[PDB]
Structure 1
Amino acid sequence: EEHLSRKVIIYSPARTATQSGSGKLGKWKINFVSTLKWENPLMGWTSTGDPYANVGDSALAFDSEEAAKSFAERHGWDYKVKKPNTPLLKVKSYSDNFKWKGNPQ
């Protein structure tokens, strides 16, 4: 009821920049934009009161855009889709390292 009207984002997390491997892509997630946390004034621990604090990154997952969109629309959430950025494969040659500079100008 109260938590069924929240706005979410459907997206595919991109590849990290610290690793060259590509094995965590193709997954689709529903971001619940849970950004209400504070510090407990006893130990400094991070407290929250939002039930969807980590379910969107720990449990809820979708193999495709269509599945996530269908789930969001069945639950009634307002969703916006962010298309993922993909690399463009370009012709690369090891011979290019030794290209002739041409006649001196």
Structure 2
Amino acid sequence: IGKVSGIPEEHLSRKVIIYSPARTATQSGSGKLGKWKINFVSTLKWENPLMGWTSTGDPYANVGDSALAFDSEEAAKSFAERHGWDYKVKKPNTPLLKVKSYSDNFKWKGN
């Protein structure tokens, strides 16, 4: 389903990374986790020399992040394998909910 999809040939030998975006460390809120996204590396972005702004050349610059977000690694892998991309799934690192309680702040250092 890569050939019928009209995508040019040179963008079906692309190497993607099917990660799950970790939580933004700045804000302690999990409302953006569990949305697996293909990551077309799309690193090539120069600076259009007339003005200060940048200028990509890869068509898959933004769609990796924007508007292409699956809901499960199986669906994302099925997607990146239909289209014939070389996906390397990077598993998401999840937190241990280690048991913790308030009364541990007021622990007694014996003597």
Name the % identity: 100
- Is structure 2 residue 62 aligned with structure 1 residue 54? yes
**Rg: which structure is higher?**
1
CA RMSD of aligned residues (A): 0.8
Within 2, Cα distance between the matches of 1:20 and 1:85? 15
CA distance in 2 between counterparts of 1:50 and 1:91 reads 47
Q: Give distance in 1, aligned partners of 2:85 and 2:99.
A: 43
CA distance in 2, matches of 1:97, 1:33: 45
Tell me the secondary structure at the aligned position of residue 64 of structure 2.
helix
Task: Give how far 1:67 is off.
Answer: 0.5
Report how many aligned residue pairs link the two structures.
Answer: 103
Return the offset for 1:65. Answer: 0.4
In the alignment, the residues of structure 2 paired with residue 59 and residue 90 of structure 1 have an alpha-carbon distance, to the nearest angstrom, of 35
Once residues 55 and 46 of structure 2 are traced to their aligned partners in structure 1, the CA distance between those partners, rounded to angstroms, is: 5
3-state SS of paired residue (1:98): coil
| TM-score calculated relative to the size of structure 2 | 0.89
CA shift for structure 1 position 81: 0.7
Please identify which structure carries the higher strand content.
1
Q: Distance in 1 between matches of 2:29 and 2:53?
A: 34
Q: Cα offset for 1:98?
A: 1.2
**Equivalent residue for 2:3?**
none
Using the TM superposition, give the Cα deviation of residue 36 of structure 1 relative to its aligned residue in structure 2, in angstroms. 0.5
**Residue 21 of structure 1: CA displacement?**
1.1
CA deviation map 1:2-41 (0-9, x unaligned): 1111100001001011111111001000000001011111
Unaligned runs of 5+ in 1: none
Q: Quick one: distance in 1 between partners of 2:66 and 2:26? A: 21
Normalising by structure 1, what TM-score?
0.94
**Gaps in structure 2 of 5+ consecutive residues:** 1-8
Q: What is the SS of the residue equivalent to 1:71?
A: helix
